[PDB]
Structures are given as structure tokens and as C-alpha cells.
């Protein structure tokens, strides 16, 4: 019986293991058979659409969508009830403009995959309305629980009769839909942009969940037009989900999960306990140095905190050291996570920039050096006057014993950066071979990997990439109005009246990004601020290579910054102790992070040197 509750998700899992299969065969076979099984590399791209949008249906059903909450903390019991209702109703409007635009996509297209002599291309676009019909039933069910829990004013039946009538008016008399434009009342011209951006930011801060809020912003521009937008964005929308580097995101998240859930962190810890710990300050040295390996295990900043936390707290506790110092170092451990492959937010920036993950990761490892080294120096700087006790001696017998038994796992980061660094493998297959590698050693060198665990891990990974899928798609609709109406030149007129240097804009934009980083969480803010500021940066002739590592580095300061910074709360959650302990614990660690930010801000040559030497 229990499977009946999530069958479309388990179909998603059965697709996903088909992906994992197709590509493990592909990459090894490509080399060894010395000619490409080309069908495989393209079939993969289709399959990803479906699992991507099944992921949206999960994030829909669970109501796990990304949003800004600040007003909810401010707001009374009633005013909530209204705004919750008003918001969720506005989302019920979203999904109909989605399905309408879905059907008005479909009969407009007749283009096969001629790279494989054309088999059933229409299947991509057809995915959107069929899975959106599942989203319709799932969404109404979810809001019924919201009303049963008193969050809202309205019953299911309201939305149902609404669905009924909206189809019926298209089925028989859509001239009365042609009446619903604002165009009988307006004179905006170019000023439409500044309106559309105002109402956008308002509905966003009203706490409309981010993807749907962007869909509302983008349809609200339709009201200003006399023209084409109906075709132009619509075809772009789901077909943009097709893009290849995004397929790496699922496998990297899966790799994080499997590697963490195998308990391998304690073995990398006990390796560091010998290799670095015999230098005094060892608690810090192991956390700081091993974080390059841990980030290579974990694939996201929260997974470093959630995985390592018990070990590093226990090590400091057994040493008798201070809990605020523990909080500080472990926050900085999570900042290392974004520097290193795997890293979701980096990869999302790659997608939204449309730039290759190769030329980004081989750049990102330079701030990998600078942050870890300066953090190591700050550990020494504090310690040599703080007066902590000196660490134990070591000898080769225990150290190499610990090395052998760990050694099979130690390759994990050295696989993913190494394959890209040497140029033998590109981003997608590096993620997939890492997934393969972590499973196969974990099956036979270790034993905790259950037969079920791959599917259990897959459903989390695919579910999280659901959130990503909505957010990418919706952002790329925003990539109609911006390129249509040239926000770049109007925002440029403000700056351009005086604007002289890259340093000027870089620090001003970093200040805005930091300021919003105080107040909107990173996993939202990334999608808020990239879409238009990347263009503005390009209008000031900035290298989008630099701007990616710079702005993703701002996100890390953001997650490190109160009041919003969620990683501070994650550290508090594992630390069992107050945010007042956390804040003074983190307080000095920001200084080397800001120095290293400023060092790259003033001198591009650092990030340039490795990528441009190897790649040029």
C-alpha cells in the first residue's frame, strides 16, 4: 500500500537511476570503444526535464518552496490569514497562466532532434502540461491542509469552481479574457520597466514564494505590452531546462548524501588527527585543513556543518577548549564548502551566467587556497596569546595504519577536482564517476550502504533539484523583459553619469549584495540578484569569470552575517548553545574573509593566473 502515496516520485527515481546508468556506461565506454555512442549523450538531456519537473511537484506538494519570511515575524494573526490567502490565491493564478502558456507552446512547435534524426521532440514540451496537471491537484491538496490548520480563509471548492470557469471561458468566449488587459487605461512606454520592477519587489517581500513571484512579475509585464511576449518567453521557458551542466547538480547532491551517510567523515577526521593534530592548535588545524577534503565529500555548506559538527565539537570538548572558538572555526569550515567542488551555488551561478563549470571550478580553487591559508594564520594568531594547552606527539606506525584504512575514501575530492584539473573529464561525468566511485568502494570496502540507500538518497537529491528547476526556469523568463526593455542602459544612466573604474562598481555591487545578504537568505538571494546585475556587470565590461567567484563569495559572507545568516543557526543547532555565543565566536573570522575578498577585489591577476595559464 504505502507506495501509492508517492508513485510519480518513485517514477522519478526510476528515471534517475536510468540517467545514472546511461552515463556510467557513456563515459567509460567513450574512451574504451574509441568512438562515441552519441544517442546516449542526448537522451540524457530529455530524461533530465522530467525528473527536474517531478522535483517541482515535490517542492509543491510539501510546500518546501524558497521564500522571504521577515514580515511574518512582524505581522498579526489576522493580517497573516489575509496575506497568506492573498499570496496563495495569486499562486493559484500563476499555475493557470502556466498551463495556458503550456498549451500555447505546444501546437506552435514541430521541431525534432535532428542530431538523432528526429524522434518525438514534442515529448519535452508535452511534459510541462502533463506534470503541471499533477501540480494542479497536488497544489490544491496542500492549501487544503493550510486552511485545516487555520492559515487562510478559503476552502478547496473556491479554487475548483475557479479552475472550472477559467477553462470554460477559453472553451466558449475568450473575448471576455481579452477584456482583462490594463491596456484600456495606460501610457507607460519605457516607464513600464520601473513599474514592473516596483511591483516585483513588492510581491517578493510580501512573501510570495520566489519562483511563483517571478512568474507574476513576468506576466505583469504582459499587461504593459501590445505585442509578442506570449510566444517569445513561453517557448524559452521549459526548453531552457534542457541545458547540460545542470545534470551535474543532481549527482553532486547525491554524492554529498552517500558520502556523508557512510560515516566516512570520522575516518578523514582520524587521518587529520595524526597528520596535522601533532602541531599545537591541532583542533583548529584539523578542522581548517580537512575542510578542503570535507567540502569535497559534502557538496554544500550545510552538509559540512551537519556532517562534521559532532566530531569537531567532541574534539574541542575533549581538549577542554572554548565553545565560541569552536563555533567560529566551524562557521569558517562551511565557508570552505562553497570554495570547492562539489558546490551547488557555484553551479547555479554557472547556469544563470550560461558559463562553463570547468573554467569556474579551476578558478574557484584559488580562493580555496587564500581563505584556508588566512584562516589557518588567524588560528595561530589567536592561539599564541590565548594560552590553550599543547597537543600530543605522533609516530609513523599509527599514522600510516590510519592512512591505509582511510586511503580508499581519500580519493573522493581528488577524483572530482583532479579529473577537471587534468582536463581528461568534463563536469557532468566528473559528478557521475564520483557517485559511482563513492557507491562501489562503500559497497565492498565498507558495508553500511543498504540496497535501498541509493533510491533513498536519490529521492532527496531529485527533490532538492526540484527547487532549483523552478528557480532556473522562472529566472530565465526574467531573461525576456531584461533583454527586451534594456534595464542595463537605464541603471547604467545613474552610474554612467559619473562611473570611472571597475573597482567603483565592484565594491558598490558587493556592498548591495552584502546589504541584502543581511536580510534575504542566500538560497533565495542568489536568484534575486544575479539576473539583472550580471548584465549590469557586463555593461561595465567586467569579466563574468571574476564576477561569479566574487559574488558567490559575497553569498558566503551573507550566510555568515546576522540577522539572516542561516548557517549561524545551523552552528547553534549542533552547538546546543546561544546565538550570543555564536556571534562572538564568528566575530574575528570575518576579517580574513573580507581581506581576501578585498585582495581579489583590488587585484584580478590572482584569479586570472591559474585559469588563464592552463586554459588559454
Amino acid at each position, epitope marked *: 500500500m504505502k507506495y501509492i502515496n508517492k508513485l510519480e516520485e518513485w517514477l522519478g527515481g526510476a528515471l534517475f537511476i536510468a540517467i545514472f546508468g546511461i552515463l556510467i556506461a557513456q563515459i567509460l565506454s567513450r574512451q574504451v570503444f574509441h568512438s562515441p555512442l552519441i544517442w546516449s549523450e542526448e537522451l540524457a*538531456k530529455l530524461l533530465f526535464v522530467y525528473v527536474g519537473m517531478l522535483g517541482i511537484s515535490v517542492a509543491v506538494r510539501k510546500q518546501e518552496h524558497v521564500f522571504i519570511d521577515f514580515l511574518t515575524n512582524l505581522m498579526p494573526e489576522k493580517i497573516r490569514k489575509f496575506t497568506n490567502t492573498f499570496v496563495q490565491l495569486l499562486v493559484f493564478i500563476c499555475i493557470f497562466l502556466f498551463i495556458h502558456f503550456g498549451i500555447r507552446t505546444f501546437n506552435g512547435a514541430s521541431f525534432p532532434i535532428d542530431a538523432l534524426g528526429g524522434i518525438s521532440e514534442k515529448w519535452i514540451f508535452a511534459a510541462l502540461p502533463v506534470v503541471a496537471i499533477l501540480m494542479m491537484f497536488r497544489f490544491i491538496q496542500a492549501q487544503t491542509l493550510n486552511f485545516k490548520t487555520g492559515k487562510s480563509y478559503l476552502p478547496a471548492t473556491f479554487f475548483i469552481i475557479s479552475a472550472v470557469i477559467l477553462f470554460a471561458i477559453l472553451f466558449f468566449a475568450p473575448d471576455w479574457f481579452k477584456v482583462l488587459r490594463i491596456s484600456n487605461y495606460i501610457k507607460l512606454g519605457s516607464s513600464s520597466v520601473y513599474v514592473a520592477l516596483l511591483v516585483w519587489l513588492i510581491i517578493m517581500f510580501i512573501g510570495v514564494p520566489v519562483g511563483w513571484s517571478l512568474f507574476i512579475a513576468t506576466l505583469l509585464y504582459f499587461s504593459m505590452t501590445r505585442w509578442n511576449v506570449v510566444n517569445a518567453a513561453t517557448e524559452k521557458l521549459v526548453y531552457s531546462l534542457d541545458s547540460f551542466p545542470l545534470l551535474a547538480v543532481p549527482f553532486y547532491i547525491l554524492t554529498g548524501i552517500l558520502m556523508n551517510t557512510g560515516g566516512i567523515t570520522e575516518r578523514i577526521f582520524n587521518f587529520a588527527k595524526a597528520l596535522l593534530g601533532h602541531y599545537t592548535g591541532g583542533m583548529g588545524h584539523v578542522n581548517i585543513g580537512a575542510s578542503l577534503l570535507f567540502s569535497g565529500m559534502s557538496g554544500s555548506a550545510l552538509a559540512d556543518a551537519g556532517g562534521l559538527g559532532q566530531l569537531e565539537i567532541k574534539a574541542m570538548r575533549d581538549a577542554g577548549y572554548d565553545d565560541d572558538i569552536c563555533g567560529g572555526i566551524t562557521a569558517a569550515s562551511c565557508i570552505i564548502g562553497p570554495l570547492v567542488p562539489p558546490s551547488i551555488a557555484m553551479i547555479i551561478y554557472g547556469v544563470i551566467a550560461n*558559463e562553463s563549470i570547468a573554467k569556474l571550478f579551476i578558478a574557484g580553487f584559488i580562493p580555496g587556497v587564500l581563505i584556508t591559508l588566512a584562516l589557518m594564520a588567524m588560528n595561530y594568531r589567536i592561539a599564541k596569546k590565548r594560552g590553550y594547552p599543547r597537543t600530543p606527539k605522533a609516530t609513523r606506525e599509527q599514522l600510516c595504519s590510519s592512512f591505509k584504512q582511510s586511503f580508499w575514501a581519500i580519493l573522493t575530492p581528488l577524483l572530482i577536482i583532479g579529473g577537471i584539473f587534468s582536463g581528461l573529464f568534463s563536469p557532468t561525468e566528473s559528478a557521475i564517476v564520483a557517485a559511482a566511485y563513492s557507491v562501489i568502494i562503500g559497497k565492498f570496502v565498507y558495508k553500511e550502504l543498504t540496497l535501498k540507500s541509493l533510491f533513498n538518497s536519490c529521492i532527496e537529491a531529485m527533490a532538492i533539484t526540484g527547487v532549483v528547476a523552478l528557480m532556473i526556469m522562472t529566472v530565465t523568463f526574467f531573461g525576456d523583459m531584461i533583454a527586451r526593455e534594456q534595464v542595463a542602459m537605464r541603471v547604467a544612466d545613474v552610474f554612467v553619469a559619473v562611473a570611472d573604474s571597475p573597482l567603483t562598481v565592484l565594491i558598490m555591487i558587493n556592498a548591495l549584495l552584502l546589504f541584502l545578504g543581511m536580510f534575504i537568505d542566500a538560497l533565495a538571494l542568489q536568484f534575486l540578484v544575479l539576473p539583472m546585475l550580471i548584465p549590469i556587470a557586463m555593461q561595465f565590461n567586467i569579466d563574468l569569470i571574476f564576477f561569479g567567484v566574487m559574488t558567490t563569495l559575497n553569498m558566503m559572507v551573507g550566510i555568515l552575517t546576522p540577522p539572516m545568516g542561516m548557517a549561524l543557526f545551523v552552528v547553534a543547532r549542533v552547538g546546543n548553545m546561544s546565538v550570543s555565543t555564536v556571534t562572538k565566536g564568528v566575530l574575528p573570522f570575518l576579517i580574513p574573509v573580507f581581506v581576501t575578498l578585498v585582495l581579489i577585489t583590488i587585484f584580478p591577476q590572482i584569479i586570472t593566473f591559474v585559469p588563464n595559464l592552463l586554459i588559454p
Partner: nanobody, 111 residues
Framework: YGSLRLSCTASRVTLDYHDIGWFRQAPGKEREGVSYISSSGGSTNYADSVKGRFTISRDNAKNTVYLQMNSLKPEDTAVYYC??????????????????WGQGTQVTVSS
């Protein structure tokens, strides 16, 4: 026989994401094209209605791409574009023109 060249000039923007493309359009239309050029391999794709005497060249590092056109027959005549078709796998021509375009240019030959 004679053959004009047209070129895309990476002005300002990134122009090496591992795709680029080119198009021309009629009176009453915006859905017509040549199909992909690859940064790597020297790979070149065309549609069969296009197969024949249209030709391809690139440099990444002075970011400069040029098309050259040998037909000189009236059906060649249109308004013309280079377009930063980027990151969409399936199609030779569909609106996969994700990030950018030139405002189009005019070229003409007749008896």
C-alpha cells in the same frame, strides 16, 4: 565567383560558451536559419535546405567569428543576424537565442 562575409564581433560580452549561430529572415517572418558552429573540433552543422556553398570561421582569443556566402542567387536575399544561441541542446533553429542578438543588417544582390 564573388562571396560576401558577415561577422559577429563579441563586442563587450562573453562569446565562447561552446555554441554560436546565424540567421536571416523574410518579409513577415522570424524563424529561419543556418544551424550550429562548434568552438571545438572544427565541427560544422547545416540544414539540408542550406547545404552547399555557405562557409564558417572563428578565433576564440580575439573573439571573432565570420560566415562567408558563395551562392549569389536571389533567394539568398533577406535581413541578417548573428545570435548568441547558448546552452540549448535540441535545436538547429528555435528560439534558443537565450542571451543575445545584433539588431539586424541588410545585404542585397539582384540582376
Amino acid at each position: 565567383y564573388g562571396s560576401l562575409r558577415l561577422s559577429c564581433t563579441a563586442s563587450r560580452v562573453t562569446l565562447d560558451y561552446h555554441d554560436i549561430g546565424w540567421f536571416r529572415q523574410a518579409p513577415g517572418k522570424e524563424r529561419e536559419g543556418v544551424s550550429y558552429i562548434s568552438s571545438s573540433g572544427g565541427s560544422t552543422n547545416y540544414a539540408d535546405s542550406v547545404k552547399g556553398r555557405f562557409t564558417i570561421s572563428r578565433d576564440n582569443a580575439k573573439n571573432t567569428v565570420y560566415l562567408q556566402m558563395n551562392s549569389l542567387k536571389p533567394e539568398d536575399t533577406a535581413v541578417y543576424y548573428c545570435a548568441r544561441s547558448s546552452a540549448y541542446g535540441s535545436s538547429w533553429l528555435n528560439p534558443s537565442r537565450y542571451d543575445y542578438w545584433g539588431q539586424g543588417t541588410q545585404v542585397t544582390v539582384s540582376s
